[PDB]
């Protein structure tokens, strides 16, 4: 592993999708990258709810649970102090974001409470975080709950920094497609069949990016795994390209931290 490896090619791209062809890499890294994107990227999310008023149908913690799953703008999450390392008592603007929710059934018809109705109270200090992610073409970001005329809901929320290992609410990856060796040339799998596996199994879409194997070919036992097809999505809190870049950065930091640990021990050694 010495820089002249990872050849990143992008087939398709959008706000929440990056379709990759990552070639010239070690399978271990292809997977490690997949994994680190899934659960080791810091995001912002409501991790505490104060219930002041709740005369709604839904239970207090039922609602609190739902609130924690609402994606919040996390573009500048790296500028937010990780709560575990925040020496400041309870919480503060340097390590948390405060949002509030106020709803009342003004109409006799069912009133819908949306995530768009969350209001940031704490000082963001110019950092691009906390804003409820709204990808609804109607503007109605995520339905929190429905509300009857005579009912009322008043909540105070505190969003913090965290990773999916702590809780799935923190993940931004959503889903990651991952495939290699379109054509079964490495024989990493033995197709189950009741007649003809060549006809019974669907040909992968990635097969069009690699020449078909010939029946006159001998098993290329020297061949290694390489060229990984991936498709990374995003929940919207982090630009899909940042999901990938930050995932990569995370691995560098992780390896660097154990490298540092090795250095630290060598420094402590005679």
């Amino acid at each position: 592993m010495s820089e002249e490896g990872p050849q990143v090619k992008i087939r398709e791209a959008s706000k929440d999708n990056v379709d990759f062809i990552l070639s010239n890499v070690d399978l271990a890294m292809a997977n490690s990258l997949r994994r680190v994107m899934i659960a080791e990227i810091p995001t912002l999310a409501i991790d505490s709810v104060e219930v002041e008023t709740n005369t709604t149908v839904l239970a207090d913690e039922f609602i609190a649970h739902r609130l924690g799953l609402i994606p919040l703008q996390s573009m500048d999450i790296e500028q937010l102090e990780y709560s575990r390392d925040c020496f400041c008592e309870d919480h503060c603007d340097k390590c948390s974001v405060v949002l509030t929710l106020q709803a009342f059934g003004e109409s006799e018809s069912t009133t819908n409470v949306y995530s768009k109705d969350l209001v940031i109270v704490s000082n963001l200090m110019g950092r691009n975080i906390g804003h409820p992610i709204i990808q609804d073409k109607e503007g109605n970001g995520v339905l929190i709950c429905k509300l009857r005329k005579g009912q009322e809901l008043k909540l105070t929320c505190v969003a913090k920094k965290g990773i999916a290992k702590e809780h799935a609410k923190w993940g931004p990856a959503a889903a990651i497609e991952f495939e290699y060796d379109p054509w079964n040339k490495l024989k990493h799998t033995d197709y189950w069949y009741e007649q003809d596996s060549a006809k019974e199994w669907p040909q992968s879409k990635n097969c069009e990016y690699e020449d078909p194997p010939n029946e006159g070919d001998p098993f290329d036992y020297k061949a290694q795994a390489d060229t990984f097809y991936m498709n990374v999505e995003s929940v919207g809190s982090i630009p899909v390209d940042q999901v990938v870049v930050r995932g990569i950065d995370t691995l560098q930091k992780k390896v660097a931290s154990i490298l540092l640990a090795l250095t630290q021990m060598d420094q402590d050694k005679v």
Partner: protein, 65 residues
């Protein structure tokens, strides 16, 4: 009882699709399958989150407290 924020298996937010989903079924009168496709719900692990959802909250709001 309201639509789960995020797909249980993915984390893909589907809590903002329910309203428009029903509109696709009512205003547009589409097949549920095509409606789910119109919502961008490609994976069946996300399609089921809406396809088999039971909106009970509408019944709960029929009571007066």
């Amino acid at each position: 009882m309201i639509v789960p924020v995020r797909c249980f298996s993915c984390g893909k937010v589907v809590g903002d699709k329910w309203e428009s989903y029903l509109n696709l079924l009512q205003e547009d009168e589409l097949d549920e399958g095509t409606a789910l496709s119109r919502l961008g719900l490609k994976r069946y692990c996300c399609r089921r989150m809406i396809l088999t959802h039971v909106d009970l909250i509408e019944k709960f709001l029929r009571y007066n407290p």
